[PDB]
């Protein structure tokens, strides 16, 4: 569908992501992992919105048609 | 409805460590992608609201002329 958006990542991609570890100055893993868990919850919430836009668009079209068919 | 915004992710800093931390360039590059995705999710959320609002309105217009 034309309305479809294409995300770079998915909930599962982020959940599976394995960063290189270093003994150089890097990021505390526990803080990055905890932040990604919130991000995963957000991706999951939004995952079906391509379909939700199509459905709303299609009902929108039907309703406008009924209305015009009155007047 | 979302726990975070693109801005929250854009502005996030992590504590530094010498003790087997994550490579910063890899994490940064990965969050750059998540920030772009959050912009697309905000646009689609806005679209779902506009369409749900329009659909409610169209139903009320049909109902009042019934």
Author numbering:
A (entry chain B): 0 to 70
B (entry chain A): 5 to 70
Text taken from the publication that reported this structure:
In the Firmicutes phylum, GpsB is a membrane associated protein that coordinates peptidoglycan synthesis with cell growth and division. The full-length Sa GpsB is a relatively small protein of 114 residues. Its N-terminal domain homodimerizes as a coiled-coil, while its smaller C-terminal domain homotrimerizes, forming a hexamer as the biological unit. Dimerization of the N-terminal domain is facilitated by a pattern of nonpolar residues every three to four residues, promoting the formation of a hydrophobic core in the coiled-coil. This N-terminal domain is partitioned into three regions: a relatively short α-helix with approximately two turns (residues 10–16), a second longer α-helix (residues 28–70) that forms a coiled-coil, and an amphipathic 10-residue loop (residues 17–27) that links these two helices and intertwines with the adjacent protomer, ‘capping’ GpsB.
Using X-ray crystallography, we solved the structure of the N-terminal domain (residues 1–70) of Sa GpsB at 1.95 Å resolution in the P21 space group, with four monomers per asymmetric unit forming two dimers (dimers A and B). The overall structure of GpsB is similar to previously determined GpsB orthologs and retains the same fold of DivIVA, though it shares much less sequence similarity. The most unique structural feature of Sa GpsB is a hinge forming at the midpoint of its N-terminal domain that causes each protomer to bend, adopting pitch angles (θ) of 137–140° (dimer A) and 156–166° (dimer B). In contrast, GpsB protomers from Lm, Bs, Sp, and Sa DivIVA are almost linear (θ=167–179°) and practically indistinguishable when superimposed. We find that there is a 3-amino acid insertion in the Sa GpsB sequence where the helicity is disrupted and that a cluster of four Met residues (Met45, Met48) are interlocked at the dimer interface at this position (dotted rectangle). These Met residues are only found in Staphylococci and take the place of an aromatic Tyr or Phe present in other orthologs, which normally stabilize the core via π stacking interactions. While the 3-amino acid insertion likely disrupts the continuity of the coiled-coil, methionine is one of the most flexible aliphatic amino acids and may further contribute to the conformational flexibility. By extending the asymmetric unit, we found each GpsB dimer coordinates two others in a head-to-head arrangement. This involves the insertion of Arg and Lys residues from the membrane-binding loop into the PBP-binding site from the adjacent GpsB protomer, mimicking the binding mode observed between PBP mini-domains and GpsB in orthologous structures, such as Bs PBP1.
